[PDB]
Design a protein around this ligand. Structure first.
Ligand SMILES: Cn1c(=O)cc(NC(C)(C)c2ncc(C3CC3)cn2)c2cc(Nc3ccnc(Cl)c3C#N)ccc21
Ligand SMILES: Cn1c(=O)cc(NC(C)(C)c2ncc(C3CC3)cn2)c2cc(Nc3ccnc(Cl)c3C#N)ccc21
Lengths: 131, 131
């Protein structure tokens, strides 16, 4: 069964939000309706502004700004590690966070900059377990 | 706990896809970055093309078409019931389907037109239980 009786009146579909997110990632893979390029040092990442805003306090601030909402190109701080950004962008579109000993510091610093609080909190807990 | 060890290597966040979908619905409520208006008889519905394509075989066909991907206005068949469309648009953004005796036929006919197969299948099962 794909549905249940929600707490409210409605029929609710268990996997709907993840099925939507999978299609948004498929659109991203195929570069369909992507409307922004995020530049991180020498690297470029195409994405959908709505997904970025939905996942980050920094992108939410940028794309709700009357002047910046219309930008096609966004340059991040040149100190941002592109691999850390790539891991977080994949997480936004998949719910899967590829945290490893060799990338955890860059992922945490990037999530702090992008304002993804629960990812920062998660990185902190994994770091504390090895200390 | 908000995360777990997925079947693959990654840490996976349980509520991430639904937290993304909630923010996409908040953006829609506030008319932020909406890029299309769907016209259903005398009624207009503002939405995000990526969400519509992610949820419907008809919108996926339209917005991947080289000519139609750029349209700001999409007119649906004038025989489509606006309430049925509204219930399905809310479902796309919430995972919640407000199926009632008084709207089930219009919801089913609209889901057939929009190519939302599992919603059609769900309507059919609820209809069959009252027959
Ligand atoms: C700071 N922060 C985060 O740590 C995480 C954000 N998003 C994700 C999806 C990663 C998220 N949200 C909630 C939760 C916890 C379980 C409840 C976890 N993960 C987030 C999203 C917006 N974005 C918006 C905020 C409010 N209203 C709107 Cl319309 C938007 C948008 N778009 C802002 C700031 C944000
Ligand atoms: C016909 N049909 C549907 O019944 C339902 C669609 N989407 C939702 C989210 C409502 C959905 N998907 C899967 C499932 C079942 C559990 C597995 C349930 N509900 C759907 C989405 C696309 N959209 C795409 C299809 C393929 N690849 C891409 Cl990139 C897109 C997009 N965008 C097409 C046709 C579709």
């Amino acid at each position: 069964n794909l549905y249940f009786q929600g707490a409210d009146s409605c029929i609710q579909f268990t996997r709907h939000a993840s099925d939507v997110l999978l299609n948004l990632n498929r659109l991203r893979s195929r570069d369909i309706l992507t409307d922004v390029v995020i530049v991180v040092s020498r690297e470029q990442f195409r994405a959908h502004k709505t997904v970025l805003m939905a996942c980050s306090g920094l992108f939410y601030s940028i794309f709700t700004d009357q002047l910046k909402c219309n930008l096609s190109v966004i340059n991040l701080d040149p100190e941002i590690n592109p691999e850390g950004f790539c891991i977080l962008l994949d997480f936004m579109y998949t719910s899967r966070l590829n945290l490893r000993e060799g990338n955890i510091m860059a992922v945490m610093a990037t999530a702090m900059y992008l304002q993804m609080e629960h990812v920062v909190d998660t990185c902190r807990k994994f770091i504390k377990a090895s200390e």
